[PDB]
């Protein structure tokens, strides 16, 4: 498979090797604010982040991703819709060549400078990949990036963006805290939907907080910088790597908030 965000292998060309591409549940969406509706028997949403063990940060030539030690429950997601015990297994961004564009779900068609997704799976399947084959294997966090003020927490991560410009680098990433990422609020919206890269799988429970969190533009001119490409290839800037919205369908989106 050779996916990607240009012409000729983006999220237009995907059904033809993912046809689930074109499904029932895909993600991400518009979220209508005037059409999603308050759900009373929501139960608070648990952030568990404090015995996070960060490991290491890849560029896949797609994105890039900061990966966690998930073979204990460390770092866990709990409550909101969700039953049981989700554990953190890696997070990863989604952002524009300018800041009119980036994120994937759009909130009234508004979209965001970026989007973070903090990726999580139902420790009842017991591995990641059996997870991703049932329809609540996953909890996604996903969290909206605004240009304004820097984000402090998110310093370490651009600060490591030199060390793996192009596909396949990896580096060291320990001792990273996600807490640093999250807003003041865990006000939510929540939806069922899928991957938003190929494979696209339908296992996903979407949480998106409703409170954006501000970036610098310094910070995000420096996820503009990676690449796409491979080292010594012609360099493609990692820009626009989002995938727009999809159809809602048969769907309700619920909101934690009055
Ligand atoms: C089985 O291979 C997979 C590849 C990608 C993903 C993710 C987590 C995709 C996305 O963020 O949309 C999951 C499984
Ligand atoms: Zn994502």
Redesign the pocket.
């Known amino acids: 498979h050779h996916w990607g965000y240009g012409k000729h292998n983006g999220p237009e060309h995907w059904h033809k090797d993912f046809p689930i591409a074109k499904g029932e549940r895909q993600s991400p969406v518009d979220i209508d604010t005037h059409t999603a509706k308050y759900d009373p028997s929501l139960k608070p949403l648990s952030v568990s982040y404090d015995q996070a063990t960060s490991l290491r940060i890849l560029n896949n030539g797609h994105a890039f991703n900061v990966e966690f030690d998930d073979s204990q429950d460390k770092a866990v997601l709990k409550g909101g819709p969700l039953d049981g015990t989700y554990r953190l297994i890696?997070f990863?961004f989604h952002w524009g060549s300018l800041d009119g564009q980036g994120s994937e779900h759009t909130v009234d068609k508004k979209k965001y400078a970026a989007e973070l997704?903090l990726?999580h799976w139902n420790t009842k399947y017991g591995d990641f990949?059996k997870a991703?084959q049932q329809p609540d294997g996953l909890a996604?966090l996903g969290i909206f990036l605004k240009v304004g003020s820097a984000k402090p927490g998110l310093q370490k991560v651009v600060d490591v963006l030199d060390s793996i410009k192009t596909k396949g680098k990896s580096a060291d990433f320990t001792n990273f805290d996600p807490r640093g990422l999250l807003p003041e609020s865990l006000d939510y919206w929540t939806y069922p939907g899928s991957?938003?890269?190929?494979?696209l799988?339908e296992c996903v429970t979407w949480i998106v907080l409703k409170e954006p969190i501000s970036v610098s533009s310094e910070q995000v001119l420096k996820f503009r910088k990676l690449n796409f490409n491979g080292e010594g290839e012609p360099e493609e800037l990692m820009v626009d790597n989002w995938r727009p919205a999809q159809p809602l369908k048969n769907r309700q989106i619920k909101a934690s908030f009055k």
Do not use: A, D
């Open positions: 890696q990863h997704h990726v990949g991703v996604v991957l938003t890269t190929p494979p799988l």
